[PDB]
């Protein structure tokens, strides 16, 4: 009757206030971490140093340019992957822990402040060892796709999309969850609970629903990479002219600013639906 309907209404309403609050937190955490992701990519894929050498009358000028060919494409390709992973991994973690935090409002507390801290600190991996492994793999893939391609080779916008698809296919069949968490290995009483949480996160990253939502974001991130570059094709350009167009994409793919790619992921209703389902699974007794 109406009593049951009121009961389900209040439960949903309660779940929804905490979920929404938790999305606001997650949105903040994503945007505060972006400059660190951006800094790590620039340091590990430093185009601007190679450029500096070229603007300084060097020998092996073509070795530097071939290096730039790889670094530029690698950096923009990795910028898209890591940004999408950043957003979706934080949605997972914050709604997994949010779920537990929601339930502890009912003797034994499952997720106290120290478990929350040690669990959330696992984001480390994506910005750390995971990112470097990701760079190594994308760099190899770019090296296979663009290695034998001349700097004079003129590429149309369609050719460039096709190179990007080839890079993607080498990467995504080399899952992507290996880059977001450290491997599980073959204790302290709240380290037990932390291990249970990291395992549940790993399982989630291997779920079809998670893989679906990450694929959506990736698709939209690479279309955007291409839309951004379309403005420079007004026709085909020499690959050497494409390098600096591609090289500069990191600044927009990893911008905190509104209307940029990260904010479109944060306001993308498909990722919210996925996050809401995570929170619900982990907040129900």
């Amino acid at each position: 009757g109406q009593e049951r309907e009121a009961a389900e209404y209040i439960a949903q309403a309660r779940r929804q206030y905490h979920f929404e609050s938790n999305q606001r937190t997650c949105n903040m955490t994503v945007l505060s971490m972006l400059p660190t992701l951006r800094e790590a990519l620039m340091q590990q894929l430093n185009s601007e140093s190679l450029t500096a050498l070229l603007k300084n009358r060097p020998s092996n000028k073509l070795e530097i340019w071939e290096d730039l060919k790889i670094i530029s494409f690698t950096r923009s390709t990795v910028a898209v992957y890591s940004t999408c992973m950043l957003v979706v991994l934080l949605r997972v973690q914050l709604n997994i822990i949010g779920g537990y935090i929601y339930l502890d409002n009912a003797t034994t507390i499952l997720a106290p402040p120290d478990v929350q801290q040690q669990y959330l600190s696992s984001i480390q991996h994506l910005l750390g060892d995971g990112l470097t492994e990701l760079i190594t793999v994308i760099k190899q893939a770019v090296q296979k796709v663009l290695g034998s391609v001349s700097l004079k080779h003129s590429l149309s916008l369609l050719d460039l999309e096709q190179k990007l698809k080839e890079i993607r296919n080498l990467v995504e069949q080399h899952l992507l969850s290996h880059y977001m968490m450290p491997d599980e290995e073959t204790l302290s009483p709240r380290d037990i609970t932390t291990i249970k949480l990291l395992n549940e996160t790993r399982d989630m990253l291997e779920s079809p629903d998670f893989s679906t939502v990450l694929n959506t974001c990736l698709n939209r991130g690479f279309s955007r990479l291409l839309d951004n570059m379309a403005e420079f094709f007004r026709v085909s350009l020499p690959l050497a002219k494409i390098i600096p167009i591609v090289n500069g994409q990191i600044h927009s793919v990893c911008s905190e600013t509104p209307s940029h790619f990260v904010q479109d992921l944060l306001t993308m209703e498909q990722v919210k639906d996925f996050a809401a389902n995570v929170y619900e699974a982990f907040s129900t007794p």
Binding site: L54, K55, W65, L151, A240, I243, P244, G248
Partner: peptide, 17 residues
């Protein structure tokens, strides 16, 4: 001794601007 390449590389170096 590749003029066309040297032109191409000089002008593309300005495109990082």
């Amino acid at each position: 001794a590749d003029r066309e390449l040297e032109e191409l590389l000089e002008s593309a170096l300005d495109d990082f601007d």
